[PDB]
Amino acid sequence: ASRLYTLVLVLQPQRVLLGMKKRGFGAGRWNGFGGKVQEGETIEDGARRELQEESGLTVDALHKVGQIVFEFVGEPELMDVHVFCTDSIQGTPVESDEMRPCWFQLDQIPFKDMWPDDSYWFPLLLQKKKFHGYFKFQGQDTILDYTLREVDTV
Ligand SMILES: CC(=O)Nc1cc2ncccc2c(-c2cccc(C)c2C)n1
Numbered sequence: 217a218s219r220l221y222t223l224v225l226v227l228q229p230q231r232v233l234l235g236m237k238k239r240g241f242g243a244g245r246w247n248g249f250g251g252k253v254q255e256g257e258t259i260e261d262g263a264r265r266e267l268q269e270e271s272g273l274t275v276d277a278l279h280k281v282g283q284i285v286f287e288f289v290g291e292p293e294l295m296d297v298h299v300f301c302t303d304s305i306q307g308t309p310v311e312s313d314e315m316r317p318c319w320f321q322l323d324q325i326p327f328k329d330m331w332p333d334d335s336y337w338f339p340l341l342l343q344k345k346k347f348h349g350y351f352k353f354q355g356q357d358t359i360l361d362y363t364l365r366e367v368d369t370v
Contacts, residue, residue, distance in 0.1 A: 218285065218296040222263035223250035225281075225301045225341060226273065230322060234330075235271060235315040246318075246330050250297070263300045271317050272310025275302045280370040281341060284333070284349040289360065298370075301341065332359055346370050 225248045226233035234246040249270040253262035264275050282299035309317035320326065322342060327335045333351045340347045349364040 217292055218294040220253040220259065220262075221250055221295050221297045222253060222259060222266055223248045223284075223297050223299045224263050224267045224275070224278070225299070226267075226271070226303075226305055227301050227341065228303050231319045232322060232325065233271065233273075233309060233317055233319055234326070235309075235317045238314055238316065240314075242331065244329075246320075246326050247315075248299075249315075259298050260300070263298065267302075270312075270315050272307055272312075274306040276304040276306065278302050280346070282337065282347040282349065283370055284337065284347075284351065286333075287350070287352045289352065289354050299341075332357065333362065336362065336364055340364075340366060 235249060237243050237245060237247050249267045250263070251266045253259055260278055263278055267273055267275050278300045279302065280298070281301045284297045284299060286295040286297065311317060325338065337347055337349055345366050346368065347364060347366050350362060351359055352361045354360050
């Protein structure tokens with residue numbers, strides 16, 4: 217009862233790229249770039265594809281940084297999200313009907329307009345730590361319970 221997703225963070229030494237989602241799941245928040253892994257597709261290939269579709273950027277090197285499972289009470293399917301980061305990209309970010317990308321200085325990450333769990337694991341991401349997390353949500357705004365631990369192997 218878990219569905220595979222990817223999430224990609226473009227993280228450079230002084231800034232991170234986030235995309236304001238205009239519609240659908242996560243609309244109105246600054247998100248990384250991700251989505252469902254397809255049939256016959258590797259998780260990493262899925263991550264590379266989502267980054268291109270949503271941001272217009274071509275990734276070169278992708279690095280595994282975490283796994284987060286999300287539970288929404290009242291929803292049977294868990295999201296099994298494989299989180300990646302990259303500092304090595306081609307292209308310039310593209311604004312589309314679906315997504316408005318913007319660069320943020322690392323001290324100006326807009327956590328109040330991001331998914332609430334980001335506040336918990338972004339600090340780890342920023343310091344190049346790897347992690348496993350689980351967040352139980354009620355609706356899209358309330359974290360009921362969570363676990364988060366650093367790991368050596370994602
Ligand atoms: C920084 C960031 O994006 N954080 C972030 C936080 C999330 N929190 C809860 C559920 C999903 C989240 C997602 C997410 C992950 C993969 C696919 C999709 C559609 C979404 C909404 N991303």
